[PDB]
Design a protein around this ligand. Structure first.
Ligand SMILES: Nc1ncnc2c1ncn2[C@@H]1O[C@H](COP(=O)(O)O)[C@@H](O)[C@H]1O
Ligand SMILES: Nc1ncnc2c1ncn2[C@@H]1O[C@H](COP(=O)(O)O)[C@@H](O)[C@H]1O
Ligand SMILES: [Fe+3]
Ligand SMILES: [Fe+3]
Ligand SMILES: [Mn+2]
Ligand SMILES: [Mn+2]
Lengths: 250, 250
């Protein structure tokens, strides 16, 4: 048996990540897959990289926020655009602790990879195989777009992140498509589900017979402590971070 | 915490049910929801109703195969169709151990029910809220149809069965939609996934903060023993049953 924790869309949420990593340790997870969006707009910098360095990471792919950080530290952002001004300040926050060499490692990652478990081929990407940004694979996405995860090249099970929602659905040909949701910025369109903003992740378990378990988990973490950490570290756009962690509005 | 086991699409598969029930009991499950398609075309008759009698079943909805059984024993099936002569023979088999009065109880079940857990309303149905048969909610079903599970009347989380596939997706408004899959007749369109025909069910765990876990489980059972039982009982259409359990073709 191999027990795999899918970690995605941490977004610098130090407290959520630590709680998810402790939950996974308790469950006796054997390996970790990192789907990307590691840093920003949350508190975590050095502490996030150190926690991941302690992990048996057997699969890793590039999120769009790794590209955004890369552009930011290379002075390609224009603050006259509100969205870039926001990103730039986040990059500046990150640059207080994280070097350019470490950012280079964060950026030097494949868009898509594959792993094999007996008869089963698993595809892994942040979003689309060739495109780690966009809205193609949202909850109401076209079947055509979802089929891209599992064909050309084929797999039996695709795992992705990016949409910040937990998911188990299918390619046209019956291939599994799974999403662990977001560790640091869980996303709900439903206002009742939104009252619960615990960290999201998932466990896959493979054994000699095939895929034996898909566990979509929620992990409690100390929100008040994360926000106190944001204040103390002078995290930019406190009120935006606050609203996403407390009210789940983005 | 309340830990709920969703049991769907048993289809008379005695050995698969016994295995799922032992897995559930080991997990400390607090209650069981029965999504329908209890009997036929598998082996279990009295044994299935006995096993379900020993459980804390807090929710139960009508499956289309319950309707079929009721119409079958009342000679209301269409003899001009091959599929319905197959069905009639399954009904006659069931009738050997099960009384007309029990079939009436099986048939007198609601199509859809609702349960509340704190802030969350859970909708429960075999297929569609007002239609327990057809192909509307297959893996590639139209979003308009899925939205019927979660609106008019509204709920935050709909659970259904009928398609014999595990599912976690969303209504247009972000409402959860889940499917435990089939205990007795797991259905795969993907050949590699089809190599593993373990029983499917799922666990929902609710706590003080909301839905904390969605665990989509596979349960190993002794297929050889179930097929030997089918022979010993003179189950009709042994070769169809064999195909369904060994090769996964329906
Ligand atoms: N269906 C959707 N409608 C609107 N926004 C969405 C949807 N799905 C995901 N998002 C947003 O996209 C964000 C994740 O993208 P990223 O910027 O790559 O972290 C989520 O946190 C949401 O705010
Ligand atoms: N996407 C699909 N394409 C073809 N057949 C399906 C699909 N989804 C479910 N089914 C069939 O419908 C059956 C369940 O319906 P029921 O007759 O109510 O047990 C499954 O055993 C499958 O054989
Ligand atoms: Fe993200
Ligand atoms: Fe069924
Ligand atoms: Mn992303
Ligand atoms: Mn059915």
């Amino acid at each position: 048996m191999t027990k795999i924790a899918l970690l995605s869309d941490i977004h610098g949420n130090t407290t959520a990540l630590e709680a998810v990593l402790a939950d996974a340790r308790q469950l006796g997870v054997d390996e970790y897959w990192l789907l990307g969006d590691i840093l920003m707009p949350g508190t975590g910098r050095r502490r996030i990289l150190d926690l991941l360095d302690q992990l048996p990471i057997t699969a890793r792919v590039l999120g769009n926020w790794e590209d955004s950080l890369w552009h930011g530290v290379r002075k390609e952002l224009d603050s006259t655009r509100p969205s870039q001004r926001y990103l730039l300040r986040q990059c500046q926050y990150v640059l207080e602790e994280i070097s350019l060499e470490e950012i280079e490692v964060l950026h030097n990652q494949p868009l898509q990879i594959h792993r094999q478990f007996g008869d089963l081929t698993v595809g892994i990407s942040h979003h689309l195989p060739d495109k780690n940004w966009g809205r193609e694979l949202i909850h109401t996405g076209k079947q055509e777009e979802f089929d891209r995860l599992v064909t050309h090249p084929p797999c039996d099970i695709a795992v992705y992140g990016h949409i910040h929602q937990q998911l188990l659905r299918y390619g046209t040909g019956g291939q599994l498509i799974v999403n662990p949701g977001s560790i640091g910025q869980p996303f709900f369109l439903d206002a009742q589900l939104r009252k619960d903003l615990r960290a999201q992740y998932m466990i896959l378990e493979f054994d000699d017979k095939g895929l034996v378990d898909m566990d979509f988990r929620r992990v409690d973490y100390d929100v008040a402590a994360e926000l106190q950490l944001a204040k103390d570290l002078r995290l930019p756009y406190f009120e935006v971070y606050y609203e996403s962690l407390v009210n789940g509005i983005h």
